[PDB]
Write a protein that binds this ligand. Structure first.
Ligand SMILES: Cc1cn([C@H]2C[C@H](O)[C@@H](COP(=O)(O)O)O2)c(=O)nc1N
Ligand SMILES: Cc1cn([C@H]2C[C@H](O)[C@@H](COP(=O)(O)O)O2)c(=O)nc1N
Ligand SMILES: Cc1cn([C@H]2C[C@H](O)[C@@H](COP(=O)(O)O)O2)c(=O)nc1N
Ligand SMILES: Cc1cn([C@H]2C[C@H](O)[C@@H](COP(=O)(O)O)O2)c(=O)nc1N
Ligand SMILES: [Mg+2]
Ligand SMILES: [Mg+2]
Ligand SMILES: [Mg+2]
Ligand SMILES: [Mg+2]
Lengths: 112, 112, 114, 114
């Protein structure tokens, strides 16, 4: 069966949800660009932890046990959340930036 | 004026675009979960490079010069692209995972 | 007062200590280069966590409370341990690699160019 | 044949060399703890780039070509240099911190528990 993502939330949805979440807690002050970047590095660390001891031969993440799948979902999400937060705090239009980068990626690697 | 992200592309759009991009180049084989994770770490490194020498007093990323804004857009995008690729390769529904994580974030930090 | 590191352990000492530690536990198999690299990334993450919510204006790490200083020591050490392990597992002579890199750094940034 | 690191430079030697290097260029101001941490993350990124597209099956770093080995040496060194600089800037005695962490590691993972 095809794997797909759910159609929502969108990146804008996530931006808004996170901005609201921060604003309700008066956390704007903690969400400066370098704080968010360091938090992002922390989350990439947590994501790496999930993979660090995995052998080549053992089951891959598509087949990980329930607890490990939950962890993987959560850390992938933490990374995305801070990345969205950081892009928003820098006034970067992340969806349109990705389109531009994908276009550049196509040029740098022609199908050839 | 309000800052917002463009409404598209969505995360599914990005998943599809990237999957197509990889498939046209026969790059599936290089896109194993640990490859994608290491590539993601590389991109977070590139993003860090943009910030590493910034003083506290100098202009923040909202006011960076054109070349630096372009770089910032591009690396934020590279991070997102690999994160999407990795989540997809692990069969994680990244948008719905984020909703779940945001719900958990609300519980762990009640507005209080 | 001038700050300095202790004269030992050296990087070789740390290589040996870690190799001893791994070998007693039969952990060689877990210490392939990409495992060690990913573990290193994890530790850099833990180190970053300690700094992530520090403001610009507030006191630096020299003034952090005992628990935070202990954490900082521990994560800096975890990073170094894996870095040594990884360099060893790749047969890189890490101390001499640093000499070579410092020499390269001097050339890329001559004093009279800043 | 048994692999070992050179006996020097030591971590103190590297601290001094980096401090000399920075001071000649008047780079102190750029070497605040969070700058050094972010620079470290950048270098871990460069190190990861070297491994990112390596397959599971293909030869390990011991067999990489001369250019890739040089890069590996250089990035491992950049990581260590910033790590030393950061530890020094935080007044952490990095060699003794590693001793303490190794002792902690032994307790958290006793041999008879694996
Ligand atoms: C503590 C804290 C959390 N989060 C959100 C973003 C992440 O998805 C999640 C991480 O929380 P923790 O660091 O407690 O795991 O909560 C956030 O935006 N800002 C914060 N100051
Ligand atoms: C070389 C390569 C690139 N990219 C894409 C994802 C990133 O957005 C961008 C990064 O390319 P580079 O590493 O050349 O900067 O291109 C990818 O998906 N897979 C690859 N094997
Ligand atoms: C679990 C494990 C630990 N360590 C050592 C290196 C670090 O200094 C510390 C990390 O332990 P933990 O991931 O449990 O915090 O212990 C190691 O070398 N190899 C392992 N397979
Ligand atoms: C630009 C710069 C360099 N280096 C040193 C530490 C690393 O070993 C190497 C990094 O140089 P580059 O970022 O240009 O590759 O040079 C440093 O200590 N401080 C700096 N402000
Ligand atoms: Mg997390
Ligand atoms: Mg990039
Ligand atoms: Mg640790
Ligand atoms: Mg480097």
């Amino acid at each position: 069966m095809p794997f797909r993502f759910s159609p929502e939330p969108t990146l804008e949805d996530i931006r808004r949800l996170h901005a609201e979440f921060a604003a309700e807690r008066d956390w704007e002050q903690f969400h400066q660009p370098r704080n968010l970047l360091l938090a992002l590095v922390g989350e990439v660390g947590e994501l790496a932890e999930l993979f660090q001891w995995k052998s080549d031969t053992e089951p891959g993440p598509q087949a990980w046990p329930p607890k490990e799948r939950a962890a993987l979902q959560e850390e992938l999400s933490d990374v995305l959340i801070y990345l969205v937060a950081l892009a928003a705090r820098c006034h970067v239009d992340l969806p349109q930036a990705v389109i531009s980068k994908m276009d550049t990626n196509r040029q740098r690697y022609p199908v050839h």
